[PDB]
Amino acid sequence: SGFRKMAFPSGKVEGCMVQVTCGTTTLNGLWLDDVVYCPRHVICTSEDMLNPNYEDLLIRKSNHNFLVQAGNVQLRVIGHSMQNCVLKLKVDTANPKTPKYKFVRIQPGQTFSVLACYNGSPSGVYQCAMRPNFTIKGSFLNGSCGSVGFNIDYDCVSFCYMHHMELPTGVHAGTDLEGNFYGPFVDRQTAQAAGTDTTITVNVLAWLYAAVINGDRWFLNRFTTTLNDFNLVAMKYNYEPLTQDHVDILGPLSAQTGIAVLDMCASLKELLQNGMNGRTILGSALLEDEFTPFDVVRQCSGVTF
Amino acid sequence: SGFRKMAFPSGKVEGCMVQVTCGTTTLNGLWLDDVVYCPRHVICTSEDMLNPNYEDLLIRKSNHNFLVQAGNVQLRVIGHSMQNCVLKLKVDTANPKTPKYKFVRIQPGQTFSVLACYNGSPSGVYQCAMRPNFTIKGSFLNGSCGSVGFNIDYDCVSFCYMHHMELPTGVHAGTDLEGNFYGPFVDRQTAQAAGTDTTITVNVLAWLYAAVINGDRWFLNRFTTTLNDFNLVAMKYNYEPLTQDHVDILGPLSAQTGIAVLDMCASLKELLQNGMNGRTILGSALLEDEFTPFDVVRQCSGVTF
Numbered sequence: 001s002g003f004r005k006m007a008f009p010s011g012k013v014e015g016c017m018v019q020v021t022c023g024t025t026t027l028n029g030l031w032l033d034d035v036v037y038c039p040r041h042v043i044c045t046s047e048d049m050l051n052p053n054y055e056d057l058l059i060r061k062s063n064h065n066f067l068v069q070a071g072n073v074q075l076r077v078i079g080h081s082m083q084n085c086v087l088k089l090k091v092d093t094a095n096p097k098t099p100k101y102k103f104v105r106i107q108p109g110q111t112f113s114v115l116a117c118y119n120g121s122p123s124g125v126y127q128c129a130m131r132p133n134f135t136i137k138g139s140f141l142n143g144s145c146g147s148v149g150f151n152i153d154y155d156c157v158s159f160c161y162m163h164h165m166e167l168p169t170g171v172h173a174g175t176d177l178e179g180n181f182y183g184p185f186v187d188r189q190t191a192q193a194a195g196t197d198t199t200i201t202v203n204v205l206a207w208l209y210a211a212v213i214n215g216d217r218w219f220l221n222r223f224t225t226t227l228n229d230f231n232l233v234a235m236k237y238n239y240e241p242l243t244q245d246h247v248d249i250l251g252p253l254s255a256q257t258g259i260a261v262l263d264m265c266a267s268l269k270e271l272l273q274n275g276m277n278g279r280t281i282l283g284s285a286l287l288e289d290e291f292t293p294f295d296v297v298r299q300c301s302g303v304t305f
Numbered sequence: 306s307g308f309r310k311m312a313f314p315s316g317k318v319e320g321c322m323v324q325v326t327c328g329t330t331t332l333n334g335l336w337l338d339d340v341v342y343c344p345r346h347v348i349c350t351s352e353d354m355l356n357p358n359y360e361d362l363l364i365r366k367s368n369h370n371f372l373v374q375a376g377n378v379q380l381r382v383i384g385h386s387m388q389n390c391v392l393k394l395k396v397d398t399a400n401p402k403t404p405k406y407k408f409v410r411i412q413p414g415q416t417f418s419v420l421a422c423y424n425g426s427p428s429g430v431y432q433c434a435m436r437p438n439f440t441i442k443g444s445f446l447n448g449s450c451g452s453v454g455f456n457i458d459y460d461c462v463s464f465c466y467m468h469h470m471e472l473p474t475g476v477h478a479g480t481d482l483e484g485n486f487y488g489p490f491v492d493r494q495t496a497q498a499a500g501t502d503t504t505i506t507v508n509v510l511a512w513l514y515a516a517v518i519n520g521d522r523w524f525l526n527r528f529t530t531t532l533n534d535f536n537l538v539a540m541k542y543n544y545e546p547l548t549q550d551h552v553d554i555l556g557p558l559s560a561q562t563g564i565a566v567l568d569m570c571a572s573l574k575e576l577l578q579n580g581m582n583g584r585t586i587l588g589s590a591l592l593e594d595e596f597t598p599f600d601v602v603r604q605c606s607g608v609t610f
């Protein structure tokens with residue numbers, strides 16, 4: 001029992017982190033097989049990032065201008081190319097620690113683990129969610145660019161995120177491992193709106209099921225609702241609309257606890273309309289939306305890797 | 306910017322986790338050099354744990370009765386001994402992945418990372434605190450015994466915790482790596498009180514400094530206090546007393562933010578007396594005590610490993 005914001009074990013990713021240097025810029029890269037992936041703004045100076053022409057900046061760069069260091073190991077760069085917003089550096093040595101892996105583009109509302117890195121060295125790991133507006137509320141300092149987010153299924157690392165930018169609002173933006181930004185953002189230091197964020201309704205419900213499984217039951221009430229009525233309330237409190245697809249994903253938690261999804265929606269409705277009245281749920285005084293239904297079943301049933 | 310409950314990268318510990326089997330009992334062990342450490346109740350049956358005589362139970366066990374498996378690798382057991390509440394199994398092979406390490410006994414209020422494991426396989430990592438009453442509020446299921454807690458300093462893993470028990474209250478108890486329980490607990494399924502817990506005042510203050518560093522400033526007020534007056538309030542709200550030693554550990558955060566420790570105490574006093582009035586601090590609607598001053602400086606300055 002107990003419920004914690006738990007991250008995937010990071011060892012399989014730690015073995016892939018390298019340092020990438022181009023000119024006077026140093027950041028983090030991801031070394032898989034014989035390719036190193038990193039944000040393309042490694043080729044920019046402080047002035048370039050205000051309005052960069054990456055095509056033109058890269059043309060002034062040759063293979064020997066990229067220094068890639070993996071601990072002591074200096075890697076020899078034998079090719080370079082730009083794919084959307086990431087640079088791909090071909091090296092002459094395959095990473096001996098390459099895990100089984102794939103590149104995935106996650107959906108808004110999905111969670112992943114972040115291995116924050118500086119100068120190629122891992123400093124910490126934490127779990128976060130892709131917001132509905134495609135930002136993430138991370139913990140990143142200067143030098144963290146090229147840190148990656150991932151999930152793990154038994155032995156296969158699914159890389160979903162590479163960190164590129166901190167917006168003036170303090171939230172974070174980045175790409176999938178094909179270099180495509182999540183959300184509307186561009187890798188340029190110029191004004192960019194993230195737009196309205198909402199709460200991930202299906203995750204909140206998943207966490208309420210986790211609370212019930214662990215003994216926190218005070219919020220269960222005598223009411224039910226309909227999907228239509230609930231979505232009226234969701235809209236009023238800037239919650240994402242709940243779909244039948246979401247109801248179905250919640251099916252196994254509903255079965256395990258014997259609480260129909262729509263009954264749990266009614267409990268959530270009453271928490272939104274009346275607040276938590278100075279109480280806590282799973283040690284939290286607000287409604288938590290960073291656990292997916294899969295996360296809750298994983299943590300509450302102890303699946304391993 | 307941003308502030309997250311961040312855990313140490315777990316790779317160095319993942320390489321040390323093995324499965325230990327004795328009879329029909331299987332749990333987690335820690336393989337360092339040529340020794341495997343695990344809870345001594347691996348030798349108990351379900352009935353034994355109600356009132357075990359570990360000396361007598363171990364006498365019925367021989368080296369070949371302990372099966373130790375590290376992935377595929379079956380380890381050959383050439384010695385066994387009991388040290389307080391842990392078993393030490395001498396194996397004939399040194400773990401090739403042994404990190405630099407030491408065994409440390411932490412103080413109440415200190416934080417560490419937990420690598421939750423099942424059947425020798427890591428499933429997740431999270432950060433927690435040793436409570437003032439020497440329990441931890443973890444996330445552990447049956448089979449998690451022998452999972453370990455640790456800190457990391459550059460390349461040296463300090464192991465501080467091995468998980469042994471879940472109490473009927475749902476909180477968790479365990480030992481240092483010499484087998485000595487934290488707190489009053491014994492490895493026996495019989496009634497055991499944990500006693501009153503308090504909030505870790507110095508950690509709360511550290512987190513308020515983290516909030517200020519990140520831009521959450523609404524809680525700073527026009528008041529100051531004295532150490533004596535603050536400790537009166539702390540006692541009323543079951544906060545740990547603040548000592549001059551604590552004030553000194555907070556010195557660098559005070560210097561960085563220009564906010565005198567006693568001024569921050571006055572802000573904390575007003576939050577305790579008046580509540581948070583429906584506001585949040587660093588995304589939390591309650592006062593958070595699981596970050597030490599060292600944690601806050603580490604996360605806010607990006608030290609790595």
Ligand SMILES: O=c1[nH]cc(-c2cc(-c3cc(Cl)cc(OCc4ccccc4)c3)c(=O)n(-c3cccnc3)c2)c(=O)[nH]1
Binds near residue numbers: 025049
């Ligand atoms: O050597 C290196 N140089 C640079 C970086 C670097 C670079 C950026 C960055 C990159 C681009 Cl292309 C545009 C941009 O715009 C911000 C903005 C957007 C919109 C409006 C105003 C400003 C920012 C950054 O955000 N961070 C950082 C800092 C703290 C936390 N997380 C990431 C680090 C690095 O890590 N290493």
Ligand SMILES: O=c1[nH]cc(-c2cc(-c3cc(Cl)cc(OCc4ccccc4)c3)c(=O)n(-c3cccnc3)c2)c(=O)[nH]1
Binds near residue numbers: 331471472
């Ligand atoms: O094979 C295996 N067998 C057993 C275990 C095991 C064993 C215990 C345990 C061990 C002892 Cl000596 C005494 C005890 O008392 C509880 C109690 C104390 C006071 C009053 C009433 C009850 C419990 C346990 O707590 N957990 C567990 C379960 C869930 C989360 N975290 C840990 C697992 C295992 O992991 N693997």
